[PDB]
Amino acid sequence: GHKIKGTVVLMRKNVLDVNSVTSVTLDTLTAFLGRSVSLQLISATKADANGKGKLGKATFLEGIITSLPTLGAGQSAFKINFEWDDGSGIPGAFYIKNFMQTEFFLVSLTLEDIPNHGSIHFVCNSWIYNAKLFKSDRIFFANQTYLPSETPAPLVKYREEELHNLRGDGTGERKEWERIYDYDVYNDLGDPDKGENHARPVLGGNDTFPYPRRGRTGRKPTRKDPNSESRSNDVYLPRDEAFGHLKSSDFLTYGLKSVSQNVLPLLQSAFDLNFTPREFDSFDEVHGLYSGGIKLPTDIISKISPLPVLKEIFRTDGEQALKFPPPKVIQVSKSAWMTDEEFAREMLAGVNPNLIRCLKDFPPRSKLDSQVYGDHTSQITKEHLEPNLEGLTVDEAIQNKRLFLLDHHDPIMPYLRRINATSTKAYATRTILFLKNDGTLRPLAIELSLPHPQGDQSGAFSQVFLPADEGVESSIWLLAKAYVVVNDSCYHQLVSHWLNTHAVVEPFIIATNRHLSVVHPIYKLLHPHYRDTMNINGLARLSLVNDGGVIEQTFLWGRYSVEMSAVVYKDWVFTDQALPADLIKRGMAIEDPSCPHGIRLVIEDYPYTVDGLEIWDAIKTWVHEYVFLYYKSDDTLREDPELQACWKELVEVGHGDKKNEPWWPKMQTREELVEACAIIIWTASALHAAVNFGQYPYGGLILNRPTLSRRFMPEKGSAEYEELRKNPQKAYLKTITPKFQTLIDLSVIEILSRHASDEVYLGERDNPNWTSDTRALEAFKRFGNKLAQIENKLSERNNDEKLRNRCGPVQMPYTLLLPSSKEGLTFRGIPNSISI
């Protein structure tokens, strides 16, 4: 016959494992070499008795390869030669068995060949556990992308069985070594076994709290409630969805889990004891968090300094102190955050730049049901509006599209009575803003509403606040804006960020692994965009969005945080997530064929939107060229059974509480697929980036983005209005997030706002050689060069002195949508995925 020459690249557990890597020819690789690892090649063109591809001989690893041009940090290569000939046909897949015992990460196999056949490459990227754990061996396919014509006949069944194996069905407790993808509802956030103070409602699968599904973990049900799932310190995810890293430090989720499992208890021990004041007393003390920091006791700066990942996150000085980095919002001016101009600017270029709407009718109305803040309206009046600017009437301002609204009235309202019985004291707020002739936005009125004067039957008890530049009235005004911000923070955290990116995306990763083979073109398109997502979500179920967790302890909606986001999810519409649709729904753009992206913006200098359209367009373009390389006609897409079962399950099961909505694209047209794939990529990439990487740079100062309010507005004559009059900084501080919780927030948002050093960016960036299809490689290249052109374009805008909203009084250039970034707390970079 002949020998096919093989190269296997893999990575040792010790090189990727969090417990080993902390730290980061003696020759360890010898153990991979006797009878330790086998491979068996599978024919793509020659079949057995009943259709299935013929198997070569299981062949063991033969020899260490010291060096190759393409090798790479932490990678080890091994020679292996497969006995094969003309008659065995061409290899298209292979089986690997690891007899070793310790798992390793299989990166790739390269076969240099026989025939006029070129090299066959296989990109595996899978941890291979001990063969005894399996039943049918780990299978990998070559490079070649194939619609489910599935394609080569001898591989058709292997293609289908791999998927059947991945779906696993839906019983059993899920184990570490497994790769089994399925759905469940959010029945695991509570701890009712610890008491019914800790029970939380199940989210999804019901009409009160509909929600996307999450990865099934199959633990045993709680003792006290058989519809909730026992808690574990170890949350399952399909193995391989959990990314390892070569540098200690890039294990960001470790740092998050440790903030709570370790840094928290031992920050109380110097509060719940007493080495540091329990409360801030001036704005100067908040700023010293970035300068000399807080001094702590040696006992406990030794418990929270010699732990993993958290070194390169808090800055020590000599000894005691836990320093924070100065956030960008204060780097040029420490006081600009208080400006009305910066308050309004942040609704266009801030952490949550998503929400503003154009006022179409007046006064603003509520969509709440039968009481009257809400069938009719808001209590802001025409005389409340126009102070120093241009003498248009409200009707004229509206007609000329110059009035805008930030409406945080309806979601918190029905829960206000309850949240206001805790330590939290909160309002439902609306804000009206006006676009000046200078193109910057100005806040004109803030309405602060509470429930049920008497009741919850004709219901709003509201007061309105108007701008003031001097005196007690200007402190009252700063407190009004804070009542707005605390509302905005919470909606940003639970809805714009958690729900709208993390939660909603997860069912797509499940649907995709369950139904599209790794060889499917659509699987390859989308795959980079799911990196580490299920992992970050698995940890947020454990430590972020859970009954005792940091989100419940920090943000306004408290204990009702997650259920409230399920109610918001009642209004979530997939196709309104596309940016252009989002802008039109909010009144922020109008369809217009004259213009650069078919859209004319109201507010031209809206940073998020103007930069985001560029990125949106670039993704849709790439998604179009790709999908039209593979789908010859709309009929070809209607005929794809993997794409159609994937879509069906997504709509019917994954996002199953919305199964009967009318807006779901039917995958009957190639355009509809491009639209859905662009939305998914958008969500996981640029939207998530926009709403996540500005958290520390903007909210790293608690004063600017407080997370909760604890005191009602000082009244009239009272002592607290007199205290306001005397030491307004202290009255400000009494109202917002206390020092303790500020510390935890900062610690968490600091890690969130960082990019790991091994992040993979949109930027044209991908893992290795993911496809042997040269047209797709090329189109992919055109996509990166476009991103590079847009990066220049956007940098040019930040240097355009006429676009004041891009900088503001804070002198903080909007760079969140620049595709490239170096790493760390940067204020930029678009990851392919929701990876933190």
Q: How far is the CB of 624 from Fe ion (least distance, A)?
A: 28
User: What is the C-alpha to C-alpha distance for residues 751 and 115, in angstroms, rounded to an integer?
Assistant: 53
Instruction: Considering the complex, state which of residue 546 and residue 692 has its C-beta at the smaller distance from Fe ion.
Output: 692
Closest of 146, 92, 97, 147 to residue 120, by C-alpha: 92
Q: Three-class SS of residue 153?
A: helix
CB-wise, 143 or 493, nearer to Fe ion? 493
Question: Which residues, 657 to 696, sit near Fe ion by CB under 5 A?
Answer: 692
Q: What distance in Å separates the CA atoms of residue 458 and residue 750, rounded to the nearest whole number? A: 43
CB of 836 to Fe ion, least distance (A): 6
Bridge partners (DSSP) listed for residue 448: 429, 463
The whole-angstrom separation of Cα 97 and Cα 618 is 42
Q: How far is CA 582 from the centre of its chain?
A: 18
Find all residues with CB under 8 Å of 768, minimum gap 6, and list them. 107, 108, 123, 125
Closer to Fe ion by CB, 200 or 755: give it: 755
- Minimum CB separation from Fe ion for residue 727, in Å? 37
User: Are 750 and 324 within 8 A, CB to CB?
Assistant: yes
* For Fe ion, the closer CB: 366 or 546: 546
3-state DSSP call for residue 333?
coil
The two three-digit tokens of residue 354, written as one number: 């998503």
Both structure tokens of 616:
């949106």
Question: Does 378 help bind Fe ion (rule: CB under 5 A)?
Answer: no
Q: Is 497 annotated as a binding residue?
A: yes
Q: Quote the least distance from Cβ 558 to Fe ion, whole Å.
A: 21
| Total binding residues toward Fe ion, as defined by CB under 5 A | 1
- Least distance in Å: CB of 248 to Fe ion? 22
Establish whether the linkage from the previous residue to 297 is cis, with ω within 30° of 0: no
Residue ranges in 691-730 that form contacts with Fe ion under rule CB under 5 A = 692
DSSP class per residue in 15-34: GT-HHHHT------GGGGGS
Q: Rounded to the nearest whole angstrom, what is the least distance from the CB of residue 189 to Fe ion in the complex? A: 17
CB of 691 to Fe ion, least distance (A): 8
Helices (runs of H) and strands (runs of E) counted in the chain: 25, 23
Nearer to Fe ion by Cβ, of 143 and 685: the residue is 685
Question: Residue 4's beta-bridge partner residues?
Answer: 82
Of 407 and 759, which CB lies nearer to Fe ion in the complex structure?
759
Is the CB of 88 or the CB of 835 nearer to Fe ion?
A: 835
Residues 6+ apart with CB under 8 A from 778: none
Nearer to Fe ion, 377 or 833 (CB): 833
Element (H, E) at 55: strand 53-55
Residue 324 CA to residue 329 CA, distance in Å, equals 14
Would you please indicate which residues are annotated as catalytic (active-site) residues? Answer: 497, 502, 688, 692, 836
Q: Which residue's Cβ lies closest to Fe ion?
A: 692
Residue partners of 807: CB distance under 8 A and separation at least 6:
798, 813, 814
Looking up tokens 């059947």 gives 164
Q: Are 303 and 269 in contact (CB under 8 A)?
A: no
Helix (H) / strand (E) element for 166: namely helix 156-167
Whether 398 has a binding-site annotation, put simply, is: no
Q: 836: annotated binding-site residue?
A: yes
CB 673 within 8 A of CB 631: yes
CB of 693 to Fe ion, least distance (A): 9
Residue 121 is assigned to a ligand binding site: no
655 is in an annotated binding site: no
Identity of the amino acid at 357: R
Binding-site residue numbers are 497, 502, 688, 692, 836
Q: Residue numbers of the site for Fe ion (CB under 5 A)?
A: 692
Residues in the annotated binding site for Fe cation: 497, 502, 688, 692, 836
